[PDB]
Each structure stands twice: as C-alpha cells, then as structure tokens.
Structure 1
C-alpha cells in the first residue's frame, strides 16, 4: 500500500537503507528495500521497513529508472534535514498466538529487541506465528519493535493466557555468502 515516508534526520545521515531492482510482479517498476541499517533515521522513524518499494524520493520519481540510478538518487540527498519518500509498504505481518497455561511454561523461542532467532520446533511460540527471521512488533497492542530483548521476554514470561502479537519482516538473510554490506543510501 502506497504511503509517504517522512524521515526527519540530520545531514550526513543519508537514511540507512539498501535498495534493489523490483523483481516482484512489477506492479510499479521501482527499488525494493532489501536491507536497512537498523539504527539510522530509517529505523529510528519506523516508516521505512524491509519489503517496501520506494516510488519517489523528494520529488525524484524512482519508478522507471534502474537500481544504480535509484541508489544515486537517494545517495544524493545525504546531507539533508528531511527525507520524503513515497513508497509502497508491503511488509508481511504474522499473528503470533502463543497460549500459556501457567507462568512456568516456556513459549519456545528467543526474542532479540525486534527480531527472532531461536524457536522450538513444534512449540507454542512456533505454533502461533513467530518465525526465525521475522520482526516482532505489536505484541497485544504494545510495540516492542524498538524495545529491549529483556522487556519483550518479560511480557511473554508473564503473559499467561493467549499472547497475541504481530511480526514484520526483518533484514534479508544471505545464507552464508556475501560478507560485505550492500550499498546503503
């Protein structure tokens, strides 16, 4: 879904995101957010997330031009105070329903601030929706996307009953190859 992304930041803080050629169905030939610094103005704001395609940046329509050109477009506005980007947010949100009969019951997973790493095969956390690679966000109405790992674990540790949360897509997993970080605009 189309959505204007206003990232208010300082000069020399580009934005902190990685874009690639939209190889999807090609609904709108633009660049896809294949990666993100996860700390800079992009993550700080929360508007820019992985799995979204930027159509235009501050008037510069990326729709039509290749990736190399698109990257240069954003890279150009590195020393600005505001980053305007009309992008289409397409982040797959999974509903994690983790039922807990008692407080001494283990959900079966590990949460690290905003991303999931560990997961028990055939557990409650896995049964609900949680998946290794996702990005937990709205847990029972509480946004933990920018919350410490200890805090998130606490809620679930004392959330007996039926833990209902949402999970977005985290950074792209590159199996093993590709040690160097991609172009960050």
Structure 2
C-alpha cells in the first residue's frame, strides 16, 4: 500500500519521524518509522504511523542507502514546509 505522504510544517521544523534500517522479512529493506512525534508534522498528516516502511522523501529513494543517509534527509527536512515522501504499507 504505497502512500504519497505529504507532511506540511513551518520552515525550521523537522518532520518528526524516526526511521531505522528495516531488516524484517517483508517488502524491500530501506527504512522503518520506528518513532514519530505524537502530534508532530508526521502525525499531523495523519498518514504516517510508527512502523511505516518509508520508501522515499520528496523524491529521495531511501532504498539502498544506510540509516545515516535517511536520517540526514529527515534532519534536512526542517525548512521545506512540506514532505512528499512515498512510504510502504
């Protein structure tokens, strides 16, 4: 279940999602929203719910890249105003 997650926030604010190197036995390993601000941008959209296997952010495929890359993407999503990240359900 692909999901065009759109996380809108104020410039200078991070999405609020914490994904980890998904290594379970399902889908293509990439990332796992292990955590997510209870009410933050991620929860605001009402789409991403801790445990979502994100696939890409604003056109940035998280597949094949380690956690360091993904984290940097989330951290760099502070002053975007919105996040077009397609996750996997």
TM-score (norm 2): 0.91
Unmatched 5+ residue regions in structure 1?
90-185
State whether residues 13 and 40 of structure 1, in contact with CA within 8 Å, keep that contact through their aligned partners in structure 2: no
Quote how far apart the aligned CAs of 1:26 are. Answer: 4.7
1:61-93 superposed Cα distances (whole Å, 9 cap, x missing partner): 11110111111122112111111100012xxxx
Mapped partners of 1:11, 1:35: distance in 2: 22
**Runs of 4+ residues over 2 Å off in structure 1:** none
State whether residues 19 and 35 of structure 2, in contact with CA within 8 Å, keep that contact through their aligned partners in structure 1: yes
- Greater relative contact order: 1 or 2 (C-alpha under 8 angstroms, separation 6 or more)? 2
Mapped partners of 2:32, 2:55: distance in 1: 9
TM-score (norm 1): 0.46
Quote how far apart the aligned CAs of 1:29 are. Answer: 2.1
Unmatched 5+ residue regions in structure 2?
none
RMSD: 1.2
SS at match of 1:68: helix
Mapped partners of 2:15, 2:28: distance in 1: 22
Aligned length: 89
